[PDB]
mmCIF file with all atom_site columns, C-alpha atoms and ligand atoms in Angstrom:
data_model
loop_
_atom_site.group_PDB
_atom_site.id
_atom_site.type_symbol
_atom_site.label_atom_id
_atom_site.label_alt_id
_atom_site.label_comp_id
_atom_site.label_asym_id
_atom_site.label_entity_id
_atom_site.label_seq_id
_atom_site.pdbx_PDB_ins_code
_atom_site.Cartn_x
_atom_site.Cartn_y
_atom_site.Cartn_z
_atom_site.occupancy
_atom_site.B_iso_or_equiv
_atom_site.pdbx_formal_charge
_atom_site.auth_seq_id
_atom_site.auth_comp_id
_atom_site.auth_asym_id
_atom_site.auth_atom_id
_atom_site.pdbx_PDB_model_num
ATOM   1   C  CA  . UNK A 1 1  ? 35.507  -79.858  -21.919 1.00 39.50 ? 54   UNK A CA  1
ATOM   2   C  CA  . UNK A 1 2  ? 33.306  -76.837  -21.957 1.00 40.87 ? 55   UNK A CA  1
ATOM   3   C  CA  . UNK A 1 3  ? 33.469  -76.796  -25.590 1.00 39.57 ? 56   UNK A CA  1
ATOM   4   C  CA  . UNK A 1 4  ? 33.576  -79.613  -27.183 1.00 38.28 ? 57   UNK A CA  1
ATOM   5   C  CA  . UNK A 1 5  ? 30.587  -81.310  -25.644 1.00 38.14 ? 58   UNK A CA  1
ATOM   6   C  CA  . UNK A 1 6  ? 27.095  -80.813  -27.463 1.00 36.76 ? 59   UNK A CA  1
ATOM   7   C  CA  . UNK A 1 7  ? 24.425  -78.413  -25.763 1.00 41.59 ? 60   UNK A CA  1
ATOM   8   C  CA  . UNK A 1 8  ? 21.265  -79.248  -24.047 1.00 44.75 ? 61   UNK A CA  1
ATOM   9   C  CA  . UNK A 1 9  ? 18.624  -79.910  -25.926 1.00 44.79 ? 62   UNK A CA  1
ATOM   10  C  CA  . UNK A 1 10 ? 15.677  -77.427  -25.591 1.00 44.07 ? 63   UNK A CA  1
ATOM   11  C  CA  . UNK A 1 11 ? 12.917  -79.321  -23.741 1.00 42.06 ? 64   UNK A CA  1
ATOM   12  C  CA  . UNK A 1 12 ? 9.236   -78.029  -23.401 1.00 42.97 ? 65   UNK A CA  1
ATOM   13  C  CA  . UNK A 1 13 ? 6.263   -79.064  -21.490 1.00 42.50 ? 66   UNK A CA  1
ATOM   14  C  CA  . UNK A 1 14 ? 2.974   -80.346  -22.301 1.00 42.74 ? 67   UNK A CA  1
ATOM   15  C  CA  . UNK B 2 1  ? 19.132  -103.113 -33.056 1.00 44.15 ? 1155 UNK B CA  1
ATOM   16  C  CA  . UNK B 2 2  ? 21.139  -101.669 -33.405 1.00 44.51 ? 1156 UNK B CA  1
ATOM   17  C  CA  . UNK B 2 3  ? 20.134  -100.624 -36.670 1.00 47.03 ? 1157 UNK B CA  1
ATOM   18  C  CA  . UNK B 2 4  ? 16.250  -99.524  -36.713 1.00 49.32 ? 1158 UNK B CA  1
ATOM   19  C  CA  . UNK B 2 5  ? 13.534  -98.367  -35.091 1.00 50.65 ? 1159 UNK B CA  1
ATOM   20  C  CA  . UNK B 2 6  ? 12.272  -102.145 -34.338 1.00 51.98 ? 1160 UNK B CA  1
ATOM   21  C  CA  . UNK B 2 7  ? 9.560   -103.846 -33.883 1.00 55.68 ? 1161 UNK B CA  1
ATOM   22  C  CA  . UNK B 2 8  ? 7.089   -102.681 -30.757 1.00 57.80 ? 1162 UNK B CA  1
ATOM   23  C  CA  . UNK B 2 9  ? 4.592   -99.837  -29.947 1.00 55.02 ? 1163 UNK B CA  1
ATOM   24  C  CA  . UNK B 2 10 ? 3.069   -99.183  -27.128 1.00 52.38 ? 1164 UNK B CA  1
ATOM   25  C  CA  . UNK B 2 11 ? -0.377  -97.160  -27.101 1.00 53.48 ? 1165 UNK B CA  1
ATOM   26  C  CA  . UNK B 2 12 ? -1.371  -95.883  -23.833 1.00 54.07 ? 1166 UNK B CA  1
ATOM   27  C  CA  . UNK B 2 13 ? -4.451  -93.405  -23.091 1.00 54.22 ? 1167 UNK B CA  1
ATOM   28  C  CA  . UNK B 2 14 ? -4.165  -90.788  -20.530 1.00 50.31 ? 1168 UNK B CA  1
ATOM   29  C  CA  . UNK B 2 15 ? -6.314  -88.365  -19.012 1.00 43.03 ? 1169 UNK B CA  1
ATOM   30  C  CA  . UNK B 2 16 ? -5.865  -84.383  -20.014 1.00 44.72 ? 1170 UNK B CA  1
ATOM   31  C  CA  . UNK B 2 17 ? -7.582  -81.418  -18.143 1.00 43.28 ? 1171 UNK B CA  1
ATOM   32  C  CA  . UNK B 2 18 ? -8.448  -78.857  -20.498 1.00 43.18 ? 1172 UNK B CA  1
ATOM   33  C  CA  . UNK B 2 19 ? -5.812  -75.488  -19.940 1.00 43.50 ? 1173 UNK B CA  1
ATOM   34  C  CA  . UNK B 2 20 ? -3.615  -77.632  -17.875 1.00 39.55 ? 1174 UNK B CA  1
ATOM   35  C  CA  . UNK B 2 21 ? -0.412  -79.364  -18.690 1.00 38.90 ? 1175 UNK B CA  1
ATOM   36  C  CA  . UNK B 2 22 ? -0.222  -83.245  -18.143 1.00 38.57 ? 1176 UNK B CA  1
ATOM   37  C  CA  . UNK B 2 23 ? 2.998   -82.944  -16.817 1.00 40.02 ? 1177 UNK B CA  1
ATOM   38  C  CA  . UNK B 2 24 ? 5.665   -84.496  -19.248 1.00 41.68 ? 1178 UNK B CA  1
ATOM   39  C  CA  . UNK B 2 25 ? 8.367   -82.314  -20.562 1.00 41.27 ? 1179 UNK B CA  1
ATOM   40  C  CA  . UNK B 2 26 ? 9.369   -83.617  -24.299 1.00 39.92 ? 1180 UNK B CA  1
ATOM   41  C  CA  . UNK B 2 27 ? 13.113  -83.063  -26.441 1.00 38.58 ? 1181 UNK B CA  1
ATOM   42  C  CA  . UNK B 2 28 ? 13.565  -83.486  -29.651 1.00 36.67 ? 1182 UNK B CA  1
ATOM   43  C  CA  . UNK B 2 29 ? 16.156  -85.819  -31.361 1.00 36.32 ? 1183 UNK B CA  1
ATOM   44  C  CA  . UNK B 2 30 ? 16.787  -84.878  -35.022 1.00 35.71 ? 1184 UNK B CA  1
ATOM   45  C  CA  . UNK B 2 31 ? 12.864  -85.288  -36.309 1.00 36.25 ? 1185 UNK B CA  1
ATOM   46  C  CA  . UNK B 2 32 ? 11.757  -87.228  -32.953 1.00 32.50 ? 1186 UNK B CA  1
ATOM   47  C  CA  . UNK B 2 33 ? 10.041  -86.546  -29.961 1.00 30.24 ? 1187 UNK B CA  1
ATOM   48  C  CA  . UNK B 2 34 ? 11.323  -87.811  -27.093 1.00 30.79 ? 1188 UNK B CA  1
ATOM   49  C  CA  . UNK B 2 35 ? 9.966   -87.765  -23.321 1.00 32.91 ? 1189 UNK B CA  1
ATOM   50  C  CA  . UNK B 2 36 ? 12.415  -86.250  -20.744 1.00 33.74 ? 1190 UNK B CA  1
ATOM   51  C  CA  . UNK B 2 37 ? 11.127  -85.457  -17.587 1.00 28.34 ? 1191 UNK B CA  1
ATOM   52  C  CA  . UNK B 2 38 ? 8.100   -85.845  -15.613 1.00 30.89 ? 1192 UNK B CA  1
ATOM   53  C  CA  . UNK B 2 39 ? 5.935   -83.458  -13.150 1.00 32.16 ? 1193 UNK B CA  1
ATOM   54  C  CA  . UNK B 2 40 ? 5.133   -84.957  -9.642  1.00 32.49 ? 1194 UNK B CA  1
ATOM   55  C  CA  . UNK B 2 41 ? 1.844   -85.713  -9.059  1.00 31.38 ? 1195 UNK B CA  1
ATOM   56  C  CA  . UNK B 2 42 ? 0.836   -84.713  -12.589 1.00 31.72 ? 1196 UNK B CA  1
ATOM   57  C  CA  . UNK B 2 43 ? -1.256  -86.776  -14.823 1.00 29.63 ? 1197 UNK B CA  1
ATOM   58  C  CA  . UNK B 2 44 ? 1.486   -88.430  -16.605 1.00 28.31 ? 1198 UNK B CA  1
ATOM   59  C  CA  . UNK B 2 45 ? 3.039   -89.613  -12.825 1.00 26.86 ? 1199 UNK B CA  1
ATOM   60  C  CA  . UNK B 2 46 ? -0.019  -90.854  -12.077 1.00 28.14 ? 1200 UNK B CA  1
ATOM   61  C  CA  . UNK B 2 47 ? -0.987  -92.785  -14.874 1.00 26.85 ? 1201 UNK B CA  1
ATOM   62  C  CA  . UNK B 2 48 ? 2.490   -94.449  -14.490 1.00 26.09 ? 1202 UNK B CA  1
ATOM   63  C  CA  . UNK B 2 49 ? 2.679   -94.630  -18.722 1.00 25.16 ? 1203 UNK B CA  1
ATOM   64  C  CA  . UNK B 2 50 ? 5.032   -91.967  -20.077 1.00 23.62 ? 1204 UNK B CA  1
ATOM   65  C  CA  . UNK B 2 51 ? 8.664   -92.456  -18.959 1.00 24.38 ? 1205 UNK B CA  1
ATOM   66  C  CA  . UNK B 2 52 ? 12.092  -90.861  -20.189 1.00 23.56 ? 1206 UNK B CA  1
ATOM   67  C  CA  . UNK B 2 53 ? 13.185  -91.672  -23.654 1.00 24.24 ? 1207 UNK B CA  1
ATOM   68  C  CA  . UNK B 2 54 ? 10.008  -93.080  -24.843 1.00 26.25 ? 1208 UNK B CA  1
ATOM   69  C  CA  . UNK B 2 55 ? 9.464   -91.814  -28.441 1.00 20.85 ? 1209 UNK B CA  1
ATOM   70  C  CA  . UNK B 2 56 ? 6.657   -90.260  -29.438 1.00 19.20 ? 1210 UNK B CA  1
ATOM   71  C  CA  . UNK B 2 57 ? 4.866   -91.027  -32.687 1.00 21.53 ? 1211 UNK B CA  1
ATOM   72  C  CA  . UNK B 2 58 ? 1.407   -89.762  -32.779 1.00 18.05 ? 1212 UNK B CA  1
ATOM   73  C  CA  . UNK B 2 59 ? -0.889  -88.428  -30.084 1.00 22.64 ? 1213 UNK B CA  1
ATOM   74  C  CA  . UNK B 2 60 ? -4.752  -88.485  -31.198 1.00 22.91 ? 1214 UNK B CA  1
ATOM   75  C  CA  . UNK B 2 61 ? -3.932  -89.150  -35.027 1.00 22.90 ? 1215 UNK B CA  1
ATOM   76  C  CA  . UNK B 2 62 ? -1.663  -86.290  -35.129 1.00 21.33 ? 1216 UNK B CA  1
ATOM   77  C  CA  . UNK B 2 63 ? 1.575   -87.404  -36.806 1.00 21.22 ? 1217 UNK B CA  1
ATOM   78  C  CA  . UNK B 2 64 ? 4.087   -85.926  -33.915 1.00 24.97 ? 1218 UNK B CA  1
ATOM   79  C  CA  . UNK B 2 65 ? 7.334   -87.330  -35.598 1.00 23.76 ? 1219 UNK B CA  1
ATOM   80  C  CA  . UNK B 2 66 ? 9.024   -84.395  -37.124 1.00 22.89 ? 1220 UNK B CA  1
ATOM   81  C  CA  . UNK B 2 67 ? 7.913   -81.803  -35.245 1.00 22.31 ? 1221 UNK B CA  1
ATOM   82  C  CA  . UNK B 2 68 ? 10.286  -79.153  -33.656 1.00 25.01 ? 1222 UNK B CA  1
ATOM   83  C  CA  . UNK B 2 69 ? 8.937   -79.296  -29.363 1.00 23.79 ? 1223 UNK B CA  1
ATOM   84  C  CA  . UNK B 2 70 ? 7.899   -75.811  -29.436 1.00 22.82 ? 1224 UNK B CA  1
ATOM   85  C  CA  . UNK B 2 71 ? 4.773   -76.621  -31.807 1.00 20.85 ? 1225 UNK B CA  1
ATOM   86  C  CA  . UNK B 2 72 ? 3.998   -79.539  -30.006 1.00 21.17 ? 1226 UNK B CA  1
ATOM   87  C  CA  . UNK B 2 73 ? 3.640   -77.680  -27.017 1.00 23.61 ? 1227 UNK B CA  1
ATOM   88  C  CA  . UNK B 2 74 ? 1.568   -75.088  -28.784 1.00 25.73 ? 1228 UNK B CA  1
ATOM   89  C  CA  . UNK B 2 75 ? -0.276  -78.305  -30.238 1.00 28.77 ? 1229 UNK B CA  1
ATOM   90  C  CA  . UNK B 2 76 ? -0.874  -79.962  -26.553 1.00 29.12 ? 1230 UNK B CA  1
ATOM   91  C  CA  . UNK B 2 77 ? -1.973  -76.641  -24.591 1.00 28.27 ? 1231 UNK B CA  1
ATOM   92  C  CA  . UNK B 2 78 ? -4.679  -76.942  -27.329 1.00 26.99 ? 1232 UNK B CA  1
ATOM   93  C  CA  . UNK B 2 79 ? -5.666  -80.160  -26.468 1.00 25.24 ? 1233 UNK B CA  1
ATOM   94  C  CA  . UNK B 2 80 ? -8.026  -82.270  -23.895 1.00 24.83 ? 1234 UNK B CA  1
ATOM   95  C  CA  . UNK B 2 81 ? -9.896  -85.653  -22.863 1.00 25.54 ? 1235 UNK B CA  1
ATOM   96  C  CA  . UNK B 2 82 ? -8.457  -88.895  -23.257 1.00 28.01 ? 1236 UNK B CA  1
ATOM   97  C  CA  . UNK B 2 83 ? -5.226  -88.297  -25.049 1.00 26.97 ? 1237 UNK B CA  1
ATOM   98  C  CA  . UNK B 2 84 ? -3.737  -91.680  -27.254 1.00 27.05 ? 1238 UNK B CA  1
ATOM   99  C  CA  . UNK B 2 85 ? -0.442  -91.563  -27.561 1.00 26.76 ? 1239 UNK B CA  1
ATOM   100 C  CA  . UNK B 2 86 ? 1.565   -94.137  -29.537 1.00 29.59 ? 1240 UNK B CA  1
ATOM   101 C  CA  . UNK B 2 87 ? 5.397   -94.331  -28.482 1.00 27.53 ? 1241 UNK B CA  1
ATOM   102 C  CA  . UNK B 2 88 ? 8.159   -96.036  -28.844 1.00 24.46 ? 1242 UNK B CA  1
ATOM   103 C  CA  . UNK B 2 89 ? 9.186   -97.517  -25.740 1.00 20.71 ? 1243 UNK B CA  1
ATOM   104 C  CA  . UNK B 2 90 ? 12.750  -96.553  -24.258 1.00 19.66 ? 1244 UNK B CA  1
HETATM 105 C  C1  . PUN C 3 .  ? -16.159 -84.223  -21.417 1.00 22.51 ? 2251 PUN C C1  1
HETATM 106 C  C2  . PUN C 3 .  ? -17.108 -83.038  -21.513 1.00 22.51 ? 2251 PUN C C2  1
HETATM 107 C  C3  . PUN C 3 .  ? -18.109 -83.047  -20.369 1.00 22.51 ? 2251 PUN C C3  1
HETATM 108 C  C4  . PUN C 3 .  ? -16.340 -81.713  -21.502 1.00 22.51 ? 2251 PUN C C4  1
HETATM 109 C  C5  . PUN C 3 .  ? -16.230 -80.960  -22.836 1.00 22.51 ? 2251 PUN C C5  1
HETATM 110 C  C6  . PUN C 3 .  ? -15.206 -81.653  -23.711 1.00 22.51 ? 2251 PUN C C6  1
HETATM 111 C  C7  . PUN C 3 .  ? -17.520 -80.937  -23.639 1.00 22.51 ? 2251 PUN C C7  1
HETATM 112 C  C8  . PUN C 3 .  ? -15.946 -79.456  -22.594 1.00 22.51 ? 2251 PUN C C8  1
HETATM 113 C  C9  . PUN C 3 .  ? -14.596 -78.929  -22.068 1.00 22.51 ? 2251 PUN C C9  1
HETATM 114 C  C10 . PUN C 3 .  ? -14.964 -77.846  -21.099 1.00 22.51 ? 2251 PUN C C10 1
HETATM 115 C  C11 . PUN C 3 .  ? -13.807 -79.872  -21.177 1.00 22.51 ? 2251 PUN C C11 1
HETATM 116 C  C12 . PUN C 3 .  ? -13.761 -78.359  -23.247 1.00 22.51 ? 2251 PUN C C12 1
HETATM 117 C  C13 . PUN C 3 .  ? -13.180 -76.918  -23.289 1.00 22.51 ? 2251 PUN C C13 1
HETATM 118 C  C14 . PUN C 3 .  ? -12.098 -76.664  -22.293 1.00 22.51 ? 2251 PUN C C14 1
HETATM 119 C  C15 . PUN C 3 .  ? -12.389 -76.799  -24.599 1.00 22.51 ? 2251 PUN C C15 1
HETATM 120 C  C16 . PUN C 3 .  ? -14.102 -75.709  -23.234 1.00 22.51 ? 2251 PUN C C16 1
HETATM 121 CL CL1 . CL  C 4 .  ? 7.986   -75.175  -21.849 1.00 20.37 ? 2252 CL  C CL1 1
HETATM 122 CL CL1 . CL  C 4 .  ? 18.842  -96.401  -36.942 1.00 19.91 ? 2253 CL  C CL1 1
HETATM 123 CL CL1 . CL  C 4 .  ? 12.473  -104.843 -31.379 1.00 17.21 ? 2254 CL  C CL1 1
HETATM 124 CL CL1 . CL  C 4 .  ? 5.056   -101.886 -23.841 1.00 19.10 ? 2255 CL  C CL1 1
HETATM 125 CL CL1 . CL  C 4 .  ? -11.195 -80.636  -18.468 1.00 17.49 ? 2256 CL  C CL1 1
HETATM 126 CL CL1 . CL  C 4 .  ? -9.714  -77.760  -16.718 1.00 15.90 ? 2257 CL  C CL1 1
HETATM 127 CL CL1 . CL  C 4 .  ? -4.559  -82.860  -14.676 1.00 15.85 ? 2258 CL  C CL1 1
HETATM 128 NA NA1 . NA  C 5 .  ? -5.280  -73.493  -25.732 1.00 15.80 ? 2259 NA  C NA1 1
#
Protein backbone atom coordinates (compact mmCIF):
# COMPACT_ATOMS: atom_id res chain seq x y z
CA UNK A 1 0.00 0.00 0.00
CA UNK A 2 2.88 2.27 0.74
CA UNK A 3 3.29 2.86 -2.83
CA UNK A 4 0.66 2.98 -4.71
CA UNK A 5 -1.35 5.53 -2.80
CA UNK A 6 -0.88 9.33 -3.81
CA UNK A 7 1.19 11.68 -1.36
CA UNK A 8 0.00 14.39 0.86
CA UNK A 9 -0.62 17.33 -0.51
CA UNK A 10 1.65 20.24 0.68
CA UNK A 11 -0.58 22.49 2.83
CA UNK A 12 0.46 26.06 4.04
CA UNK A 13 -0.92 28.54 6.38
CA UNK A 14 -2.31 31.88 6.12
CA UNK B 1 -22.92 17.48 -10.09
CA UNK B 2 -21.34 15.64 -10.68
CA UNK B 3 -20.03 17.33 -13.54
CA UNK B 4 -19.16 21.18 -12.68
CA UNK B 5 -18.33 23.54 -10.43
CA UNK B 6 -22.23 24.49 -9.86
CA UNK B 7 -24.12 26.99 -9.05
CA UNK B 8 -23.41 28.80 -5.39
CA UNK B 9 -20.81 31.18 -3.78
CA UNK B 10 -20.53 32.11 -0.66
CA UNK B 11 -18.72 35.54 0.28
CA UNK B 12 -17.83 35.89 3.80
CA UNK B 13 -15.62 38.84 5.41
CA UNK B 14 -13.26 38.12 8.13
CA UNK B 15 -11.13 40.00 10.31
CA UNK B 16 -7.05 39.91 9.68
CA UNK B 17 -4.39 41.30 12.17
CA UNK B 18 -1.66 42.73 10.33
CA UNK B 19 1.78 40.15 10.71
CA UNK B 20 -0.43 37.51 12.05
CA UNK B 21 -1.88 34.48 10.42
CA UNK B 22 -5.78 34.04 10.49
CA UNK B 23 -5.43 30.63 11.16
CA UNK B 24 -6.58 28.47 8.09
CA UNK B 25 -4.13 26.17 6.51
CA UNK B 26 -4.99 25.92 2.53
CA UNK B 27 -4.01 22.72 -0.25
CA UNK B 28 -4.08 22.92 -3.51
CA UNK B 29 -6.08 20.66 -5.95
CA UNK B 30 -4.75 20.83 -9.54
CA UNK B 31 -5.25 24.91 -10.05
CA UNK B 32 -7.58 25.24 -6.77
CA UNK B 33 -7.30 26.32 -3.44
CA UNK B 34 -8.77 24.43 -1.04
CA UNK B 35 -9.17 24.99 2.91
CA UNK B 36 -7.79 22.11 5.09
CA UNK B 37 -7.39 22.75 8.51
CA UNK B 38 -8.14 25.29 10.99
CA UNK B 39 -6.14 26.99 14.09
CA UNK B 40 -8.03 26.99 17.50
CA UNK B 41 -9.02 30.06 18.65
CA UNK B 42 -7.73 31.81 15.52
CA UNK B 43 -9.68 34.24 13.54
CA UNK B 44 -10.99 31.87 11.07
CA UNK B 45 -12.45 29.53 14.31
CA UNK B 46 -13.93 32.32 15.52
CA UNK B 47 -15.63 33.78 12.78
CA UNK B 48 -17.12 30.24 12.27
CA UNK B 49 -16.87 30.92 8.10
CA UNK B 50 -13.95 28.99 6.60
CA UNK B 51 -14.34 25.19 6.90
CA UNK B 52 -12.44 22.15 5.19
CA UNK B 53 -12.84 21.77 1.51
CA UNK B 54 -14.30 25.07 0.83
CA UNK B 55 -12.71 26.39 -2.42
CA UNK B 56 -11.23 29.39 -2.66
CA UNK B 57 -11.77 31.79 -5.54
CA UNK B 58 -10.70 35.23 -4.80
CA UNK B 59 -9.78 36.97 -1.57
CA UNK B 60 -9.94 40.98 -1.88
CA UNK B 61 -10.17 40.94 -5.85
CA UNK B 62 -7.19 38.84 -6.09
CA UNK B 63 -7.95 35.98 -8.50
CA UNK B 64 -6.63 32.98 -6.02
CA UNK B 65 -7.67 30.10 -8.47
CA UNK B 66 -4.50 28.87 -9.97
CA UNK B 67 -2.18 29.66 -7.64
CA UNK B 68 0.43 27.11 -6.28
CA UNK B 69 -0.22 27.54 -1.84
CA UNK B 70 3.19 28.69 -1.32
CA UNK B 71 2.45 32.21 -3.09
CA UNK B 72 -0.68 32.49 -1.50
CA UNK B 73 0.85 32.29 1.68
CA UNK B 74 3.49 34.77 0.66
CA UNK B 75 0.33 36.76 -0.73
CA UNK B 76 -1.72 36.53 2.79
CA UNK B 77 1.32 37.32 5.29
CA UNK B 78 1.14 40.52 3.13
CA UNK B 79 -2.20 41.19 3.82
CA UNK B 80 -4.69 42.89 6.56
CA UNK B 81 -8.26 44.39 7.58
CA UNK B 82 -11.35 42.95 6.55
CA UNK B 83 -10.40 40.18 4.22
CA UNK B 84 -13.45 39.06 1.40
CA UNK B 85 -13.12 35.90 0.45
CA UNK B 86 -15.36 34.25 -2.15
CA UNK B 87 -15.44 30.28 -1.92
CA UNK B 88 -16.94 27.60 -3.01
CA UNK B 89 -18.66 25.90 -0.36
CA UNK B 90 -17.65 22.14 0.47
C1 LIG C 1 -7.34 50.27 10.40
C2 LIG C 1 -6.20 51.26 10.63
C3 LIG C 1 -6.39 52.00 11.94
C4 LIG C 1 -4.85 50.55 10.63
C5 LIG C 1 -3.96 50.74 9.39
C6 LIG C 1 -4.50 49.90 8.25
C7 LIG C 1 -3.93 52.17 8.87
C8 LIG C 1 -2.47 50.47 9.73
C9 LIG C 1 -1.92 49.06 10.03
C10 LIG C 1 -0.97 49.26 11.16
C11 LIG C 1 -2.90 48.07 10.63
C12 LIG C 1 -1.19 48.51 8.78
C13 LIG C 1 0.28 48.00 8.78
C14 LIG C 1 0.49 46.74 9.56
C15 LIG C 1 0.57 47.50 7.35
C16 LIG C 1 1.42 48.93 9.15
CL1 LIG D 1 3.07 27.07 6.11
CL1 LIG E 1 -15.89 18.80 -13.08
CL1 LIG F 1 -25.19 23.59 -7.31
CL1 LIG G 1 -23.43 29.39 1.84
CL1 LIG H 1 -3.78 44.93 12.66
CL1 LIG I 1 -1.02 43.23 14.38
CL1 LIG J 1 -5.99 37.58 14.78
NA1 LIG K 1 4.37 40.90 5.18
Amino acid sequence: MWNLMPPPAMERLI
Amino acid sequence: GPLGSGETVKIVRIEKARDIPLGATVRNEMDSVIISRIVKGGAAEKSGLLHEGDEVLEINGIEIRGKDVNEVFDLLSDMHGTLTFVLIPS
